[PDB]
Each structure stands twice: as C-alpha cells, then as structure tokens.
C-alpha cells in the first residue's frame, strides 16, 4: 500500500509478511516454520589486511528495512 512510495521493494514486503505469519503460528509448530524466516546471511568483501568488510548495501533484518 504505502510502502511502495517509500522505495521498499516487493521482495522485502514478502519477507515481512512471512515473518509475521510465522509469528502467529502456534508455539508448538513455530519451530518448524521459523527456521524458514531467520536471517543468517551477510555480504562480505575480503579486506586489504585479510579481514571481512561487511557491505551495507542491502539490509538483512526486517526491523532495519
């Protein structure tokens, strides 16, 4: 609805909906579904010294969308 005007993409819209839907599931069944909506990904470039420089181009958490 109003999220398109703010630049939010459709894919991010779906991720938020899926997290909310998994939130409403019973506590007994939440474990199965919640494993499908738990961010565990990052974008990293190898730094000059041999470290990990995290790229902040795309958000990972629905809170920061």
């Amino acid at each position: 609805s109003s999220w398109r005007d703010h630049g939010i993409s459709y894919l991010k819209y779906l991720n938020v909906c899926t997290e909310t839907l998994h939130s409403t599931v019973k506590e007994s069944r939440r474990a199965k579904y919640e494993r499908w909506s738990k961010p565990c990904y990052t974008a990293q470039r190898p730094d000059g010294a041999g470290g990990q420089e995290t790229i902040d181009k795309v958000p990972i958490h629905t809170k920061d969308y």
Binding site: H6, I8, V16, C17, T18, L21, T24, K26, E27, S37
Partner: protein, 161 residues
C-alpha cells in the same frame, strides 16, 4: 564448453493449449500448491480453488481462462470433488491459471489455517499497534502496518471459521 540450463533437469513442464483447437469439458482442476520450492499438493485433481488476489477474490474452476494473479496475505480454499474443504493461509506470491485446466499457486509461505493460533495473533496485533505508535519514521510505520494487515487478516480468517 556449454552448460545445461537448470530447467533441463525438470521433467514436469507446463502444457499450453493451442488457440486453434477444440474445447474440452473438464470436471477437475489440477492444482499445484507450492511453498519455498516445496509442493504441498502436486497435480491434485480438485473441484475448485478460491484465492484472494489484489483486486479481489477469485473462484477458479476447471476451464478457467488464462490469468496471472498477484496474491495478498490471505486464506486459500481448496474444495475437492468428494466434498472436502482444505484451508491454507498464504503470506504472498503468485497464482498462474491455465486454460488447459491447471493452476500453479506458488507462495512464499503456505500454512494450514489450523496451525495458526488466534490468541498469539490477537496479542501480536496489540503489540504491533503499540509499535506503530512508537514508530520512528514513515518507513518504520509502513513496515509495521504491513505486519498489522497480515495479523488482522489472520485474525479475521480464523474468526470466520
């Protein structure tokens, strides 16, 4: 050095009916309900399927014209020829309806309405509404409102039956 395309290994293609062909009377709709690259139902013959797309609700029966529907967070109903109703709830995705008598409903998440809890849904709505009040900016408010819409749809879906 040519590489195979990843669709070559998939042996269940989509059959399209030529425009210059005779019509057939079909009493079964072949439904394929899918979640995150997993089919909950596969080429299942059903009597009808009810889906809630952006514009409104569609009742798809065999022979329905070719159409593509952008789903919204909502319930989805499947009624078999036997007379049995199975109700899922989807958070989004697309539904492709083919005039050949097939309906491929691909969803990001498709959960049976039984699994969802109304008590959990109700209290989440109260929390998110409080979160919306404390939402910092316009973007945060829009995200919170997305959650509320899904929650209210879930709450309304369960209160219906």
């Amino acid at each position: 050095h040519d590489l195979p395309e990843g669709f070559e290994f998939m042996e269940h293609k989509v059959v399209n009916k030529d425009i210059h062909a005779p019509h057939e009377n079909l009493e079964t709709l072949r439904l394929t309900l899918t979640r995150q690259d997993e089919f909950l139902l596969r080429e299942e013959p059903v009597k009808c399927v009810t889906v809630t797309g952006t514009n409104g609700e569609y009742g798809i029966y065999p022979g329905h014209a070719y159409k593509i529907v952008q789903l919204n967070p909502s319930p989805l109903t499947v009624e078999y020829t036997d007379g049995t109703t199975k109700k899922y709830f989807v958070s989004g995705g697309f539904a492709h309806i083919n005039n050949e008598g097939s309906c491929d409903v691909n969803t990001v998440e498709c959960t049976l309405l039984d699994d969802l809890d109304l008590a959990i849904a109700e209290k989440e709505l109260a929390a998110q509404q409080a979160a919306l009040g404390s939402a910092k900016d316009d973007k945060a408010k829009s995200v919170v409102e997305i959650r509320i819409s899904v929650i209210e749809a879930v709450i309304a879906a369960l209160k219906h039956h």
